[PDB]
Amino acid sequence: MPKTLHEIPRERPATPLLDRASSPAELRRLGEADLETLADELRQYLLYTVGQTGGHFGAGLGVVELTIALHYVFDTPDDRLVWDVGHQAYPHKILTERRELMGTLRQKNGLAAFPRRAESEYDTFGVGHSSTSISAALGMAIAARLQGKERKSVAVIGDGALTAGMAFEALNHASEVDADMLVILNDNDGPGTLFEELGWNYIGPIDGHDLPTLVATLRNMRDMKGPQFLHVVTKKGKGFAPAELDPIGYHAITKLGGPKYSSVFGQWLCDMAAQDARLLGITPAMKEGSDLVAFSERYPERYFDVAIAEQHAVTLAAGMACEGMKPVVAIYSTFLQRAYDQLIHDVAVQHLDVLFAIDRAGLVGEDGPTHAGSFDISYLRCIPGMLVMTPSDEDELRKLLTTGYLFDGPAAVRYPRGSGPNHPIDPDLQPVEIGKGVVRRRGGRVALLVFGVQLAEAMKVAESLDATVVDMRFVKPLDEALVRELAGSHELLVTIEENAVMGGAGSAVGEFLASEGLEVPLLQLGLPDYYVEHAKPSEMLAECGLDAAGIEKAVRQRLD
Amino acid sequence: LHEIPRERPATPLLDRASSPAELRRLGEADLETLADELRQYLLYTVGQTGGHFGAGLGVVELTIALHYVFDTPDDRLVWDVGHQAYPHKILTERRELMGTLRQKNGLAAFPRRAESEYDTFGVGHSSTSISAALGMAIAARLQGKERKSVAVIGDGALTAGMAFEALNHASEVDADMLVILNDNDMSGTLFEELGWNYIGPIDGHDLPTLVATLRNMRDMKGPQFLHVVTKKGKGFAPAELDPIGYHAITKLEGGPKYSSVFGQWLCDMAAQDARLLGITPAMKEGSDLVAFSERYPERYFDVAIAEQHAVTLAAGMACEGMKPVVAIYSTFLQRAYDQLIHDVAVQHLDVLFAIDRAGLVGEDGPTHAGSFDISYLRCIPGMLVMTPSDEDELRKLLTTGYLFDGPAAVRYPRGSGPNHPIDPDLQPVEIGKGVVRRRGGRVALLVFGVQLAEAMKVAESLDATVVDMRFVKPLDEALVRELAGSHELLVTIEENAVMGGAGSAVGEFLASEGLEVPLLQLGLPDYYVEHAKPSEMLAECGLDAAGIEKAVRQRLD
Ligand SMILES: [Ca+2]
Ligand SMILES: [Ca+2]
Ligand SMILES: [Ca+2]
Ligand SMILES: [Ca+2]
Ligand SMILES: [Cl-]
Ligand SMILES: [Mg+2]
Ligand SMILES: [Mg+2]
Ligand SMILES: [Mg+2]
Ligand SMILES: [Mg+2]
Ligand code: NA
Ligand code: NA
């Protein structure tokens, strides 16, 4: 009989067998009967180390036994293993020469949040966004078949990630080319006939915590040919009672302010829905992260979780707007990249009335560059019809959400993870004038044109220089009249945005100055042209020069 | 049935069926004769204007049955892609407007909300119909309106991920909607499993069976799925015999296409490099991988209408040391942006993107315009971004991007070029260096792409310098620094949105170095250019020689 734990170890547990299984080859030197003892130990170590660093929690616990069985049966790293999303791959990392590096997990210069090709030869594909594993593993198998290399290709994909359209495309295509690969459905939330129809050989469901059945099944399927589909059933949080009971809260943990911007949005969504029965709320499977929680309890008939289906979320919004409803698509900047065609082709080309509440805009911290919201100003502002907005604090977020909502056409409001300066929030629901900035400080000589939440750091810098500071509010349409005035009365314009400099809000200013032959010097601050390694957000901002110290240095260095 | 009528057919029944309301006043016994009349009119008018041909022939009877049975426009009909909707337009107050089809200020290529209350959703890209019809159906329920929602989708469109996403969600919410699969590759278990009530397959040209089935299903509840089977080109033997050829025709009565320059390059490079792999999301003919697919069938991959899987498939292949080339139109690469960023660029994996239909594309209009790829790609770290100016440069820059170890893109337009000679070698050029084509005095034209010939006609008039920039990323920074100091105005030219484009790459560099020279950015404007001939669209945008010269002379004054 399995035991269940209710507490996290505060001290390094004794794992004498896990320590002999530091790599897959050493693991495969062990005996089948020891494997369940190895599992208990790895589970114990996993609880301990995540309690030490924080990180993802419940999903890894669900795949302890599956991960053991895969590295025992398959000749890794020669056999290719692709983890979908990778938040469940801490056990993987533990078994692939990183056990004693777990203490550096998610810290600057330590192990990254997900499998990462640069991090280890045992990581075949950098993941983070979901549902890429089947496609990636198909690519690997097609290439290995052509090269004659006789390696296996295995994709482990959760039942959630299977809701994405790109997973369906890969399953179809793999059948097309009769690829020799294995898809393991890690299902933890009449299964078989669908996958048989799509041309796969379906096996299961089997118990994903039964190591003897897992090993024998995988042994049998390892050398089967053609597209193989193994359906495994797991318990999220398995072995830790709190996580078993509340898998949502234990999806991640912290190691043992004002409101979050997502909470300011969530409150706005409720308040406007109480005033306006037209409002509909849409999320591609991120209710807790984007924080539609209270909204979905209060307005269940007007809340739509479309699963991991960004593309359908946006075109669905377009159809609702066609009937005069007022959809709000809640979506992180990094995940909106996957619905760009629907946004352009179905919303923008038709000028449809859809609001995009873009959370996690800018650097996102420990999750690193796979999740960075670095590009949405650049990829949205080039799209005709888009209203593009950058609130600088909690009050501005509520106001710009109202403005884009009420605007008759497509609008984007972008904001970062975390909390803000904690300024007062006007409880009313009124918009602001579209295309007009707010002068937050009258100065001289240097003008800081701020798009977004670096305003408070720019205010610190302006004090030393007696600079003008504008809270721009709008990337598109730009406050051209204000920029024109500032360009004639100042000797230097300085743009500041938590977005790539290339194609960004500062370049809209640059484009405006050029069209009118305004000759004023321009300094664009923002995110550089490389992928910023995972660290604390404050650490990442400092790296990019977007704290007061970096901005002052950049302005000072230009003027000297 | 053998010849496109060259004079207007007699269609007394059709002329009584100018709107769906009048259609529904006819008798079922009249409907087969209407369809014969509708088919001959369709034949006639598309022979006078050009346009899509074969798919609409396939839905003559289906369109009649839909509008006969459903109370359109109040009931919502959504056509996937829309190239099959010419029957639909003929029956929705536009029959006598069909002579303007695909001409400037005439009917658009596709259903378009701004055009007609009968068009529920502007389409062009594929596989959007189910998502849109579902949002309409959810809205109608919340509003307590009792209208129907119908999506017509082809079998190809169903290969796209977003159509699967919409089928699952429609089942999840138990939407009252009808999906009609217009299957013209000739044909249930799958759709039942996904939560749908499956009926069919039925003969999509048997009007009696169509009207009866649709009536029955019209008032069933929940997600309903009707499988109809149609013949591509039905009723016109040339088109039934060559559906690829008769997908679209020109009206009745000199250099290689750029896509064929690409296709020759792909074969030539594949002969040299066993590692090369060619991927297309269902556009073998359009991107021109025809000869490649015949000579290298084991290294050619058509993933269906599946841009997302295409790009991540390539990333996997590049992980094992193979050399994938992703052939994809600019407008369609929009749908795989995330895979390019997350799976390719973040990993700096060695994948070449051959981006066709870059710029304006003519009569298909703004749904297919390649207006944005320079803006959405150049902001992505790691990307090599190139803009060839003619046939020879396309070949050279593909070789440049292919030899590069890393993510690379080469964008080129539909149509043909200035027809300059083409070096048959496969040699690269130096990454990040432009080429001065002409030395002049007071203006410098920094040209990213195929407007170079037009710029060259203007450079004479103004005695201007002209640079073939070749690269957007990395920019030839030193050459720009030199031109900034020796000229009174820099002019950037690109067949891309000005906002965020290659002109803006130049501006960013100038601003970062304190170079204060004046900068005029020419390119595509910040609206959707209405369908017209390519030359008319380019003229509208100022990107012909005359428009480039007027723009420059204006600024100097
Ligand atoms: Ca939900
Ligand atoms: Ca405020
Ligand atoms: Ca409508
Ligand atoms: Ca040849
Ligand atoms: Cl730049
Ligand atoms: Mg799951
Ligand atoms: Mg502030
Ligand atoms: Mg078809
Ligand atoms: Mg290469
Ligand atoms: Na107030
Ligand atoms: Na043709």
- Where along chain A do its domains lie? 18-245, 261-414, 438-559
Residue to mutate among A346, A354, A530, with most B CBs inside 10 A, is A346
How far lies B400's CA from each of B261, B370, B382, in Å?
Answer: 15, 22, 15
Choose among B136, B303, B343: nearest Cβ to A323: B136
Token pair recorded at residue A39:
């599992």
Q: Is A106 a catalytic residue?
A: no
Return d(Cα B323, Cα B420) in angstroms, integer.
29
Q: After which residues is chain B broken (C to N over 2.5 A)?
A: 187, 253
Return d(Cα B506, Cα B492) in angstroms, integer.
8
How far lies A352's CA from each of A523, B70, B526, in Å?
Answer: 35, 26, 17
Choose among A132, A335, A384: nearest Cβ to B312: A132
Return d(Cα B227, Cα B211) in angstroms, integer.
14
How many alpha carbons lie under 13 Å from residue B90 in its C-beta half-sphere? 30
Token pair recorded at residue A347:
């919303």
Q: Is B335 on the interface with A (CB under 8 A)?
A: yes
Cβ–Cβ < 8 Å for A185, A232: yes
3-state helix, strand, coil in chain B (%, to 5): 45, 20, 40
DSSP-based three-state secondary structure for A43:
helix
Tokens 């300059």 belong to B420
> From the CA of B395, how far away is ligand 9's center (Å)?
15
DSSP-based three-state secondary structure for B497:
strand
Return d(Cα A238, Cα A247) in angstroms, integer.
10
Choose among A132, A385, A506: nearest Cβ to B343: A132
Tokens 């992980």 belong to B319
DSSP annotation string for B10-48: P-HHHHT-SSHHHHTTS-GGGHHHHHHHHHHHHHHHHHH
How far lies B82's CA from each of A503, A543, B104, in Å?
Answer: 33, 49, 19
Task: Please choose, from the candidates B518, B489, B483, B498, the residue with its C-alpha nearest in 3D space to the C-alpha of residue A513.
Answer: B518
Within 8 A of A194 by CB-CB distance, chain B residues are 190, 193-194
Looking at residue B66, its amino acid is L
Within 8 A of A327 by CB-CB distance, chain B residues are 135
Return d(Cα A444, Cα A441) in angstroms, integer.
10
| Number of H-type helices and E-type strands within chain B | 24, 19
> Could you tell me which chain A residue has the CA closest to the CA of B129?
A315
Residue to mutate among A507, A523, A524, A527, with most B CBs inside 10 A, is A507
- A438-559: CATH number: 3.40.50.920
Those residues whose C-beta lies under 8 Å from the C-beta of residue B265, and which sit 6 or more positions away, are B394, B395, B398, B399, B426
Q: Helical H runs in B273-369? A: 284-287, 290-295, 307-319, 330-333, 337-338
Return d(Cα B557, Cα B555) in angstroms, integer.
5
Cβ–Cβ < 8 Å for A390, A399: no
Looking at residue B248, its amino acid is A
Tokens 């909300």 belong to B113
Cβ–Cβ < 8 Å for B98, B90: yes
Return d(Cα A290, Cα A42) in angstroms, integer.
33
DSSP state of B536: H
Q: Is A174 on the interface with B (CB under 8 A)?
A: no
B495, containing H or E segment: strand B489-497
Token pair recorded at residue A34:
């020891």
Q: Do A164 and B166 touch (CB under 8 A)?
A: no
Those residues whose C-beta lies under 8 Å from the C-beta of residue B352, and which sit 6 or more positions away, are B323, B324, B325, B326, B398, B401, B402, B408, B409, B410
Cβ–Cβ < 8 Å for B338, B312: no
In sign, the C-alpha dihedral spanning B293, B298, B303, B308 is negative
DSSP-based three-state secondary structure for B117:
coil
Return d(Cα B395, Cα B398) in angstroms, integer.
5
E-strand ranges in A121-259 read: 153-158, 181-187, 201-207, 227-233, 252-253
Token pair recorded at residue B71:
């109370």
- B258-411: CATH number: 3.40.50.970
Q: 3-state secondary structure string, A417-430?
A: CCECCCCCCCCCCC
Tokens 């000229």 belong to B487
Q: Do A312 and B343 touch (CB under 8 A)?
A: no
Within 8 A of B298 by CB-CB distance, chain A residues are 146
Neighbour count for residue A297 (Cβ, 10 Å): 10
**A205 prior amide bond cis, ω within 30:** yes
Q: Is B122 on the interface with A (CB under 8 A)?
A: yes
Return d(Cα B331, Cα B329) in angstroms, integer.
5
Return d(Cα A16, Cα A19) in angstroms, integer.
5
Exposed (0-12), middle (13-18) or buried (19+): which is B164, by Cβ within 10 Å? buried
In CATH terms, B435-556 corresponds, of 3.40.50.1240, 3.40.50.920, 3.30.70.890, 3.30.420.10, to: 3.40.50.920
The length of chain A is: 560
Instruction: Spot the catalytic one: A99, A151, A152, A338.
Output: A338
Report residue A40 CA to chain centroid gap. 31
Within 8 A of A335 by CB-CB distance, chain B residues are 338
Looking at residue A24, its amino acid is P
Return d(Cα B418, Cα B116) in angstroms, integer.
40
Please name the method used to determine this structure: X-ray
Q: 3-state secondary structure string, B414-456?
A: CCECCCCCCCCCCCCCCCCCCEEEECCCCEEEEEECCCHHHHH
Those residues whose C-beta lies under 8 Å from the C-beta of residue B120, and which sit 6 or more positions away, are A322, B76, B77, B78, B111, B113, B132, B133, B136
Q: How close is the nearest chain B Cα to the Cα of A144, in Å?
A: 7
Return d(Cα B381, Cα A116) in angstroms, integer.
17
Q: How close is the nearest chain A Cα to the Cα of B307, in Å?
A: 9
Q: What is the structure's resolution, reported in angstroms to one decimal?
A: 2.1
Cβ–Cβ < 8 Å for A524, A495: yes
Cβ–Cβ < 8 Å for A140, A152: no
Instruction: Spot the catalytic one: B232, B323, B396, B414.
Output: B232
Cβ–Cβ < 8 Å for A84, A156: yes
Task: Please choose, from the candidates B398, B399, B397, the residue with its C-alpha nearest in 3D space to the C-alpha of residue B435.
Answer: B397
Choose among A317, A370, A506: nearest Cβ to B346: A370
Is position A160 annotated in a ligand binding site?
Answer: yes
Task: Please choose, from the candidates B350, B355, B320, the residue with its C-alpha nearest in 3D space to the C-alpha of residue B337.
Answer: B355
How far lies B386's CA from each of A65, A528, B429, in Å?
Answer: 48, 21, 11
**What is the side-by-side strand order in the sheet with B408-411?**
B300-302, B276-280, B323-329, B352-356, B408-411, B384-386, B471-473
Within 8 A of B512 by CB-CB distance, chain A residues are 523-524
Return d(Cα A362, Cα A497) in angstroms, integer.
9
In sign, the C-alpha dihedral spanning B284, B289, B295, B301 is negative
Return d(Cα A451, Cα A472) in angstroms, integer.
5
Cβ–Cβ < 8 Å for B497, B451: no
Q: Is B475 on the interface with A (CB under 8 A)?
A: no
In CATH terms, A261-414 corresponds, of 3.10.400.10, 3.60.9.10, 3.40.50.970, 3.90.870.10, to: 3.40.50.970
Q: Is B317 on the interface with A (CB under 8 A)?
A: yes
Q: Helical H runs in B50-188? A: 54-57, 60-69, 86-89, 129-143, 161-172
Instruction: Spot the catalytic one: A41, A65, A310, A396.
Output: A310
Give residue B512's region: left, alpha or beta (phi > 0; psi -120 to 50): alpha
**Beta-bridge mates of residue A386:** none
Return d(Cα B241, Cα B238) in angstroms, integer.
5
DSSP-based three-state secondary structure for B313:
helix
Return d(Cα A389, Cα A403) in angstroms, integer.
9
How many alpha carbons lie under 13 Å from residue B165 in its C-beta half-sphere? 32
E-strand ranges in A117-180 read: 153-158
How many alpha carbons lie under 13 Å from residue B245 in its C-beta half-sphere? 7
Within 8 A of A139 by CB-CB distance, chain B residues are 312-320, 324
DSSP annotation string for B217-270: HHT--SEEEEEEE--TTTT-HHHHH-TTTTSEE-----PPBHHHHHHHHHHHHH
Q: Is A99 a catalytic residue?
A: no
Q: Is A427 on the interface with B (CB under 8 A)?
A: no
Protein fold of A18-245:
Rossmann fold (3.40.50)
Q: Helical H runs in A11-162? A: 24-27, 35-53, 58-62, 64-73, 90-93, 133-147
Cβ–Cβ < 8 Å for A79, A156: no
- B12-249: CATH number: 3.40.50.970
The backbone torsions φ and ψ at residue B170, rounded to the nearest 5 degrees and listed phi first, read -60, -40
Neighbour count for residue B298 (Cβ, 10 Å): 10
Do B435-556 and B12-249 fall under one CATH topology? yes
Token pair recorded at residue B196:
């749908």
Task: Please choose, from the candidates A109, A123, A41, the residue with its C-alpha nearest in 3D space to the C-alpha of residue A77.
Answer: A123
Cβ–Cβ < 8 Å for B55, B84: yes
**B281 prior amide bond cis, ω within 30:** no
Task: Please choose, from the candidates A361, A355, A555, A371, the residue with its C-alpha nearest in 3D space to the C-alpha of residue A460.
Answer: A555
Token pair recorded at residue A257:
């302010």
Token pair recorded at residue B310:
């295409």
Q: Are strands A227-233 and A181-187 parallel, antiparallel or unpaired?
A: parallel
> From the CA of B483, how far away is ligand 11's center (Å)?
46
Looking at residue A398, its amino acid is R
Cβ–Cβ < 8 Å for B203, B62: no
Vertex B57: Cα angle to B56 and B61 (nearest 5): 95
Q: Is A467 on the interface with B (CB under 8 A)?
A: no
How many alpha carbons lie under 13 Å from residue B275 in its C-beta half-sphere? 14
DSSP-based three-state secondary structure for A143:
helix
Return d(Cα A497, Cα A267) in angstroms, integer.
25
How far lies A501's CA from each of A167, A171, B498, B505, in Å?
Answer: 33, 38, 16, 10
The length of chain B is: 557
**Beta-bridge mates of residue A202:** A229
Return d(Cα A169, Cα B292) in angstroms, integer.
23
Is position B526 annotated in a ligand binding site?
Answer: no
Cβ–Cβ < 8 Å for B406, B382: yes
In sign, the C-alpha dihedral spanning A342, A503, B378, B496 is positive
Cβ–Cβ < 8 Å for A514, A531: no
DSSP-based three-state secondary structure for B112:
coil
How far lies A35's CA from each of A27, A83, A220, B345, in Å?
Answer: 9, 21, 18, 39
A219, containing H or E segment: helix A211-222
* Interface contacts A/B by beta carbons within 8 Å: 328
Task: Please choose, from the candidates B541, B328, B331, the residue with its C-alpha nearest in 3D space to the C-alpha of residue A344.
Answer: B331
Token pair recorded at residue A400:
């710009």
A461, containing H or E segment: helix A455-465
Task: Please choose, from the candidates B222, B130, B124, the residue with its C-alpha nearest in 3D space to the C-alpha of residue B179.
Answer: B130
Those residues whose C-beta lies under 8 Å from the C-beta of residue A70, and which sit 6 or more positions away, are A76, A81, A154, A156, A184, A218
Q: Which ligand is nearest to the CA of A426?
A: 10
Return d(Cα A204, Cα B402) in angstroms, integer.
44
B150, containing H or E segment: strand B149-154
How far lies B307's CA from each of A341, A544, B68, in Å?
Answer: 11, 33, 36
Token pair recorded at residue B525:
């404007």
3-state helix, strand, coil in chain A (%, to 5): 45, 20, 40
Token pair recorded at residue A546:
């977007």
Q: Do A350 and B122 touch (CB under 8 A)?
A: yes
**Residues A129/A135/A140/A145 CA torsion (nearest 10 deg):** 170
Q: Chain A neighbours among B 364-393 (CB < 8 Å)?
A: 366-367, 372, 375-376, 378-382
Cβ–Cβ < 8 Å for B120, B78: yes
Q: Is A138 on the interface with B (CB under 8 A)?
A: yes
How many alpha carbons lie under 13 Å from residue A92 in its C-beta half-sphere? 31
Q: Is B335 a catalytic residue?
A: yes
Q: Chain A neighbours among B 185-204 (CB < 8 Å)?
A: 189-190, 193-194
DSSP state of B178: E
> From the CA of A426, how far away is ligand 10's center (Å)?
5
Task: Please choose, from the candidates A187, A168, A262, the residue with its C-alpha nearest in 3D space to the C-alpha of residue A232.
Answer: A187
Looking at residue B311, its amino acid is V
